[PDB]
Amino acid sequence: HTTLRKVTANTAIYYDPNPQSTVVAEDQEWVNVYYEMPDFDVARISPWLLRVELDRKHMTDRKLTMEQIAEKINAGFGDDLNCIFNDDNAEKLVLRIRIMNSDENKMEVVDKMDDDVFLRCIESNMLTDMTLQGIEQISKVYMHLPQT
Amino acid sequence: AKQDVIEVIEKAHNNELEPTPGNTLRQTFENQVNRILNDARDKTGSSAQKSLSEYNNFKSMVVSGAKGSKINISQVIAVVGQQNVEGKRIPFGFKHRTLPHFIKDDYGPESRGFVENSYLAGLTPTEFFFHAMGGREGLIDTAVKTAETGY
């Protein structure tokens, strides 16, 4: 069993009203390549950035690709969660998650779930139950050539 | 054996100890140290056993099967060996030290319960206390096994 936590180095929730601003200067080079083609861009996207950095060793030891993590996140959280991955070649692996609104217009006011705490709840849920690989209840698998 | 343990400790202190898969760094360090100490005690036991004449009475009662084993001969003559509590070396009961007589973070054989002396030679005070700690576990197991096995 490999959750997202097993392969994440650090996870930070930023505030980016404009993706082209890219408060992290290291992410500006590649984030502009994804907003040329708009997922929903212009439609109001949550200005909150769930930025997760993936450990290189813990991810190469499992032959995990950031595309696989993106697919898992999409499957587990529906289309209302944009996900972008930097690159395999990049010295540090970066995953950026937003909370794209439905944007259907008009259509429970108390049921708001503020995006700042919603991102934190989503991050906790991802780090606890992402099940990127393996079978639940299988904590650790040992591999050896028997002598007996 | 003590020099080998010192070399392993130096490798661990210099981050040169590569962790064996399925084990942590502390776990692989303890595995290496226990391997060295067990190999040392086996070698010393073999040396002590080969030195016994045909008139030796320990060997007489061992080869007959009446009482005793080769490990008893090794501990009497060569080396008592490592003393373990709960299957591990003697724990750091004090802050990062087994006894007040040792410096902190002392993972050498002497501090963690390896009795270099034999029963004929006699144990040092630290070895005496560590041997008492080791035999206490056997006494507890003896006193506690009876009820569960009877149930």
Place this chain on the structure above:
Amino acid sequence: VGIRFCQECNNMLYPKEDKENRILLYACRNCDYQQEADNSCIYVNKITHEVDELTQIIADVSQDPTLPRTEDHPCQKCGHKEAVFFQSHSARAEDAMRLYYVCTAPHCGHRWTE
């Protein structure tokens, strides 16, 4: 990453969103105080928790007689021969048996790992 307190009632500030100017704000939930964020980062979680333990080491540990000391590793700052070394002495240290060295002699208090 840090926590900012109110300048009116000294209560904890919570981040809030400015719909008009699109700027992060820290707004008190006990009164009407607001302020502009400078760091722009709200939450930081380090799963690998790779933190330099030298920040959590006190220079006074050089006064402990129960810790070992060697002259083989001199201090980087003052070049003092004596130095006291110790392991992590910390839980959740991942897998590390490395040594942390603290310089002896008063008022230097240099801490380094090698």
Place this chain on the structure above:
Amino acid sequence: EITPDLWQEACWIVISSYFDEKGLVRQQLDSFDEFIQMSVQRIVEDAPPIDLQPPRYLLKFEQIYLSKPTHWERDGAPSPMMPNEARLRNLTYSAPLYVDITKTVIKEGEEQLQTQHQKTFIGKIPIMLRSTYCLLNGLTDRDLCELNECPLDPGGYFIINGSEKVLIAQEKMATNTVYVFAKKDSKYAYTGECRSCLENSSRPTSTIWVSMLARGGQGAKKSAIGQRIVATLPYIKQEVPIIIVFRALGFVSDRDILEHIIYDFEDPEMMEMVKPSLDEAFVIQEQNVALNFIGSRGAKPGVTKEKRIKYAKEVLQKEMLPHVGVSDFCETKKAYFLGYMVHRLLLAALGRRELDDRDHYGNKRLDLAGPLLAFLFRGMFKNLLKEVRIYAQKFIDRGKDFNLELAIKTRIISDGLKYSLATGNWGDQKKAHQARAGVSQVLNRLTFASTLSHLRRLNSPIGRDGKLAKPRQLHNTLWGMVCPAETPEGHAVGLVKNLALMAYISVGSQPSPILEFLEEWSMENLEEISPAAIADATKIFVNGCWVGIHKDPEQLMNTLRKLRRQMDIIVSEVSMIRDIREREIRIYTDAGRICRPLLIVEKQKLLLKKRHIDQLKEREYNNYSWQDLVASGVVEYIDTLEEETVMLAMTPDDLQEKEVAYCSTYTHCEIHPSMILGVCASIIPFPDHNQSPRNTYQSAMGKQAMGVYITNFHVRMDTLAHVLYYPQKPLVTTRSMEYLRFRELPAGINSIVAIASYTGYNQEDSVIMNRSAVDRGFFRSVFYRSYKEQESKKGFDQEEVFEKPTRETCQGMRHAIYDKLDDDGLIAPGVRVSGDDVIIGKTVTLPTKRDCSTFLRTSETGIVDQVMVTLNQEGYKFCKIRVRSVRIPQIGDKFASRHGQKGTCGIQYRQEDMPFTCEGITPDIIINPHAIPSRMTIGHLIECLQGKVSANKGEIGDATPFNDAVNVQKISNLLSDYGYHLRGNEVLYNGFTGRKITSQIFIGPTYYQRLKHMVDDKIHSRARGPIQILNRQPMEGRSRDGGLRFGEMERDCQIAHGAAQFLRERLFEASDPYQVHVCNLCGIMAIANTRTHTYECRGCRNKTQISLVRMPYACKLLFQELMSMSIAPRMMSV
């Protein structure tokens, strides 16, 4: 001025000085003296004055007075009571307690009349023997022998109704100290606790828990690495969030709470961990609403808001961490300490501080005689005041007057102390189940070593049936504090522990001078402290109470150590611990801390110089003692948690010298490493050459060895007393046996022992004894049995009289012979008495006479040694008859060396039959060589070799454990100088044939012990004797002529044999056989009149169809009990 290579003499000189100044029971003596001199007065004063009301009556207790133990003979005549008189007459060696009482009245006439009641008797406190208030204090050996008291008797026990009771030290977790643990399956990830007691002045303990709620979601807030700290205050139903507790203390803003919790705001991880706790308590933002929230979850919610607020405020002020404070403005101090607890919890959760372990003896305290008696006396004095108040309230409603002398019932204190010391149930008699049992054991007088072990013994209050192996393990912190070898093998392994020889237990001190010095030495009180200046500073704890912070900890510790070394302001009991990593200085003055003396190493040199040794060598007529050594700053008492911060040298001349460097910062040195052993483990020669279980077995066996247990055994009327004919001091001895008084009172004989296989009768663990040696007195012993009997007047005309019954004057009578009794019905000494003979003739007047005489225990066959006649407490006739029996060692008696080699006597051969050397030497004992190899008692072999060397040389061999100067090769070379083979082997000749034995035999004088366990005391045979009244099955016990139990395992074994008939015999025929008549219609038993043959079943009107059924009587009893529970176990024969 140093002691190089002369260290062996010097260390044992300082140890001899220590044991001359202190002794072995000094812990108990000091604890009891502190209880009497300080604790009783403090308990009496701390009791609130009796306020009653209209006139008002006030009662105040000023000062308590103790006297010597005196006996009020019947009439009342006061008289000094000696301990031997207490033992003989079954008296309680106790001293009356008088307290001055002031009674004031208020008549509303502007004049209050106060009456002072000087020396008002309130009860008798049992006095520990040889204590300050005992009559044996300060008496010389001649004075002690004049009172028939053994000079070697250490004292330290109480005499309750003649029986000698010893209070065992009860372990407890150290109070006022914050402990953080992590339970496995609990709802709390980490739990911090602090058992707080207010300077032991009042209230037992109030425990506060600060715990962090696991890891799963707390509904809507926890989305991080593990959070939601909660608190469990006493007298509150359920959990209260910690921020609400802080707001109930007057701190409303989050910054104040965090400053009291987090000391450096530059640390983001801790603030992140504490944030959701703030989030949970976001709704509560005022002090009063927090108080209301706390009060609403109390024992019973208040009707209105204000009473709830007052109740919560009272709970927080009094019952929440009372050791921090209990009065008014202590809210700031309580907030600081609660924040410290939360800080510790966060550090444990963050992984920055390791979790505390319960087995660390620095985290443990030992409740000696003093604290235990204080705990009992506090409750007893409270009950006495309650009864005085009840009496006064009853007598004041009339308004006539009030009397204090009749209002005080001294019986309450006297009987409470006497009962709790007698039965051992520590608590009220009505609450015996809630009372801890096992305290105050009966003092073991089997051997002097046994008495010393019982007087130096510790107890873990945890349950013996518990299978948890960790508390039973030998913790590293027990070094020099608790003997690693002496542990009760069995259900108390690791739990009952014994003190090391040098171990001392702190008696307690008031931390007023320490606090005054801390204020006078700058420091900074918590009230005057700005929280911004607390991260860099070091917290100063005194008895757990955080008193302030100090910015220069090195200088403070140096000054405190200097003061304790000079004994100026800090007494030697006080422990001072500096946690450098955690920036904490902990100072402890409380009682119960276990400490041992250690030499002080400054630079790399001992402070113990040659001049100290020279002065100690002349200890007599010099007034130079151990106290002078301590007052000179050479030795220091260090307890376990201070021993954490010490750097110890095992030996000076080996570890402080310059070599390949391991440690150069040694701060202390061991006086001698052999001091880690207790009383019973210090009689082992060469214990470091034995397997540790064998050392434990010998430690257990030494208390069972027989010698001269006490010198005044002639005056003692003790049941089950064993004395040895010819005790000998060991030829191979330890340097500690001098301080154990083992040479004076030894239990064993140096026996020529051959480790050989002679005729097969020493196989397994058995031994072969020399019959001729046994004839010459070898290991002969005497058994003393004392019989107590008492005349009494119970009925209106019923009475007991000691008299010799005639053939027909007594209704009951036995076939025994009463001709040995005298005119008083007591057999005179010198009369040989066999089994069934009458010891004391007593008659009971039946409302003519009924025989209540006492007979010998079966098959004793002894001779009456001494008969004592006296008057007991009630003044009735009281008799103690001691019967002596000489017990020659048979082939069933148990013998053991000092190495765990126990065994019975397989057979006895005479001198001609025993194997003999060329010099005619025949071994007194022959033990099998097979007992050695697996059990690995090499110390036994080395003891034999050294004893052979010493007997031929004329010295006494030195077998101190870690000598480095006594090797086996040196002993062999010494033996070779006396015409013997160096390894101890000697050529033996077969006794029967005169032929040489092909293998040469290892022969030498080895010290052996005769154990209490003898075959005659253990041999039993049953053939259809007494049966139980209820079960109608054979009685239980060898003494009651009982039958052996054929238990469930035996039944299973016979089932496996398929022996149905033998199983039926054992479980039906051999035990109770019975017949019942059951109805045939119903299965219920029927009325059966066998003589009239009228069988009737009430319920069926069945007189014809009734069957006879053979069943065990226990089965009929079971069926009748089931019918008593409305179950119908209908036995159907159809």
Place this chain on the structure above:
Amino acid sequence: TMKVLRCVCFFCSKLLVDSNNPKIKDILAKSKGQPKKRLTHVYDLCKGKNICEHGGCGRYQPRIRRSGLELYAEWKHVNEDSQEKKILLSPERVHEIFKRISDEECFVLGMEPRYARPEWMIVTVLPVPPLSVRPAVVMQGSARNQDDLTHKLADIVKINNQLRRNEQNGAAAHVIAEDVKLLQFHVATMVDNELPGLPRAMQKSGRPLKSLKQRLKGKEGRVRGNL
């Protein structure tokens, strides 16, 4: 008693699910010779009902709750009328309920009427063990000692006589309830002195009484230590 109460209509002795119903027929076919499994299956069926109708009557059933030795009935969703949704369900009420359960209906519950009827599980006539079960101890012949069972029986007789005298005289209708509670405690503590949450019977000197259950329960008991 509680389980049987949950399987029957209060104040209308009738199985909540009828025997003619196919489910009860299946339970009887599967549970021939296994009365305990029959009762547990019927209890599982009847715990999910809240009205006595297939059969007869029809009235909302209570929720039986135990508090120590007392039973309380919670009549949630009652019509109106008498209401009183918190009664103290007395042993007398349960006895009258069980006396009217027919032999067939109690047989479906697994209680064979000729061996055990539900109302017999309520103590109306208390058995008194013979003198053999509770022997008297002779102390020199001057005084006679008694067993713990004899002392508990003395307490039961005292409280029973007090209750009977108050019933004859009339009393105050709440001292009657106190006497009933005390008699229930004594009777239940004679049988078992190890019930959680209840005070233990102490004859004197603060020693708990050894009940019949304690006589029979563990090792050193009757079956383990005497048979």
Place this chain on the structure above:
DNA sequence: TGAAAGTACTTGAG
């Protein structure tokens, strides 16, 4: 100071 493991009941949650 410090048991753990199973289960039957009981309760909201579907």
Place this chain on the structure above:
RNA sequence: AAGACCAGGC
């Protein structure tokens, strides 16, 4: 008269 506790044995 048989319970509680304690100590012990193997």
Place this chain on the structure above:
DNA sequence: TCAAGTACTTACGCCTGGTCAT
């Protein structure tokens, strides 16, 4: 239907003896 609570139980074999208070 479920599943997560919470109450509630249950582990020593034989043997010895002593003492204590009912």
